[PDB]
Amino acid sequence: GLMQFTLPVRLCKEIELFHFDIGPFENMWPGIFVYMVHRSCGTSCFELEKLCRFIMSVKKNYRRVPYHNWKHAVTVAHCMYAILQNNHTLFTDLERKGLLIACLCHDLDHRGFSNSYLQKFDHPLAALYSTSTMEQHHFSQTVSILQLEGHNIFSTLSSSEYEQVLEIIRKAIIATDLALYFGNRKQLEEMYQTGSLNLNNQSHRDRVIGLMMTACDLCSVTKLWPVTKLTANDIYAEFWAEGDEMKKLGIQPIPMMDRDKKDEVPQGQLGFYNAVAIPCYTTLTQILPPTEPLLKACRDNLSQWEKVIRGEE
Ligand SMILES: O=c1ccn(-c2cccc(OC(F)(F)F)c2)nc1-c1ccnn1-c1cccc2ccccc12
Ligand SMILES: [Mg+2]
Ligand SMILES: [Zn+2]
Numbered sequence: 001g002l003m004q005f006t007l008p009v010r011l012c013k014e015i016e017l018f019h020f021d022i023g024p025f026e027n028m029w030p031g032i033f034v035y036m037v038h039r040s041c042g043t044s045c046f047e048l049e050k051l052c053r054f055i056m057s058v059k060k061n062y063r064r065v066p067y068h069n070w071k072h073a074v075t076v077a078h079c080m081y082a083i084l085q086n087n088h089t090l091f092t093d094l095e096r097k098g099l100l101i102a103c104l105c106h107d108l109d110h111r112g113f114s115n116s117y118l119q120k121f122d123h124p125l126a127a128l129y130s131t132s133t134m135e136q137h138h139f140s141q142t143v144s145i146l147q148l149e150g151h152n153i154f155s156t157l158s159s160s161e162y163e164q165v166l167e168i169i170r171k172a173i174i175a176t177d178l179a180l181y182f183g184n185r186k187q188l189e190e191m192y193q194t195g196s197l198n199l200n201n202q203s204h205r206d207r208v209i210g211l212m213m214t215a216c217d218l219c220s221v222t223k224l225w226p227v228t229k230l231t232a233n234d235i236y237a238e239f240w241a242e243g244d245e246m247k248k249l250g251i252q253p254i255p256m257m258d259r260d261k262k263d264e265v266p267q268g269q270l271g272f273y274n275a276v277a278i279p280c281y282t283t284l285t286q287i288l289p290p291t292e293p294l295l296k297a298c299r300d301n302l303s304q305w306e307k308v309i310r311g312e313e
Contacts, residue, residue: 001043005035018082018219018293021227022074029074030055033104036081041096050153057145061108066237068110077103079219079294083212086290090199094157098165099209101142101153102172103216108141110134112238113245115177120249132177139173168209175210176217178276184210185283192286208287215284215294221277222297225304236265266308273302 007015014020015032022032033055037046062070080103084096091099115133118126129136143166145151154162175184188207191197198204220231243257255261256268281295307313 003048004043005031005038007032007035015078016082016085018079018086018291019223019227019297020078020082021223022071022078026070029070030059033074033077033100036078037100040081040084040100041093045093045097046153047155050150050155054145054151054153055104057148057151058104058108061141061145063109063111065110065112066241067231067234068107068112068238073104073107076106076216076219079103079216079222080212083216083288083291087288090288094161094165095168095209097154098168099172099212102169102213105142105145105169106138106173106176106213106217107134108138108145110138113242115179117242117245120246120251132174132180135174135177138176139170142169142173171206172209172213175213178214180210181214181276181280184214185279188287189283192283197287211280211284211287214280215291218277218280219294221273221301222281222294223301224297225301228301228304232265232269236262266305269305270302270309273298273305278302 006012011023011032015035022029030052034048034051037051058073059070062068062073077100080099084091084099113134115126118133123133125133125137146154146166154165157165174180184207188197188211191204191207199208220228220235222228223231239257240259243253243259246253246257252258255264277298278295281291281298285292285295304313
């Protein structure tokens with residue numbers, strides 16, 4: 001109860017910023033996460049012993065893939081922590097508890113393959129869940145680990161609150177299906193411009209939480225250029241592996257995933273910042289003004305990719 005997790009000075013300060021990188025020391029990421037729960041939610045909200053057992057089982061269930069790994073889980077949870085701390089009074093005690101857990105678990109047991117590949121391979125998970133295939137898996141895994149012994153970190157919640165928080169986590173995880181993002185932002189933009197957006201409408205909160213989730217999940221594009229540049233390697237290493245597996249099924253993959261078309265990447269990153277990332281942080285800044293740093297940093301990197309194309313690096 002009196003055991004305040006503290007970080008070294010540079011981490012204690014840099015962690016409050018949106019562009020924080022959690023660094024190369026795996027063994028520190030669990031301390032970083034707990035520190036974020038304690039600051040974001042209270043020393044009270046979870047039982048330190050049960051939390052630690054839960055974190056470690058979740059770590060154990062992320063795989064050794066180039067990008068969709070434990071480090072991504074904790075990076076996405078850090079961004080969410082940054083948003084919650086910069087919007088201190090907009091969110092309930094339960095949302096804060098559930099949203100940091102949703103992010104840590106959002107990519108549980110990812111193998112580095114898109115829903116498309118699962119469908120074209122005819123993976124058993126594609127029979128079980130037709131849409132948002134991996135995302136229903138990730139939630140289903142979160143529920144599994146919650147149900148292990150000494151792992152129920154929500155035990156002190158009523159039956160009501162327990163169902164509300166698991167329903168926050170489910171929508172949160174589902175919303176990381178980028179196919180769902182496009183229509184979700186369209187609707188939030190229209191509600192905001194015609195002034196009908198209302199954070200008491202549970203239907204509207206749900207949409208806003210989904211957009212935060214897209215924003216946290218994309219947050220590699222909001223880091224300082226050297227971090228963004230080096231993460232793109234990890235992202236594309238998974239893309240090229242999936243393309244290889246597409247070719248193995250007798251299917252020319254889209255160029256994004258074709259490793260023979262490495263040369264087309266910088267223009268592909270342009271597409272994605274213009275079509276996906278910039279729109280995402282624009283609409284999110286309109287709803288939650290204090291998240292502006294993510295937009296600025298995203299623009300900064302869009303600009304860094306244009307420099308790549310113009311042979312200035
Ligand atoms: O640089 C990029 C170029 C293209 N896509 C992309 C486009 C279209 C569908 C798409 O998802 C799919 F691969 F499942 F098909 C990814 N994403 C990124 C990117 C930047 C930061 N994160 N990130 C992501 C990399 C890999 C899975 C991501 C999943 C969701 C959001 C961002 C994901
Ligand atoms: Mg995912
Ligand atoms: Zn993710």
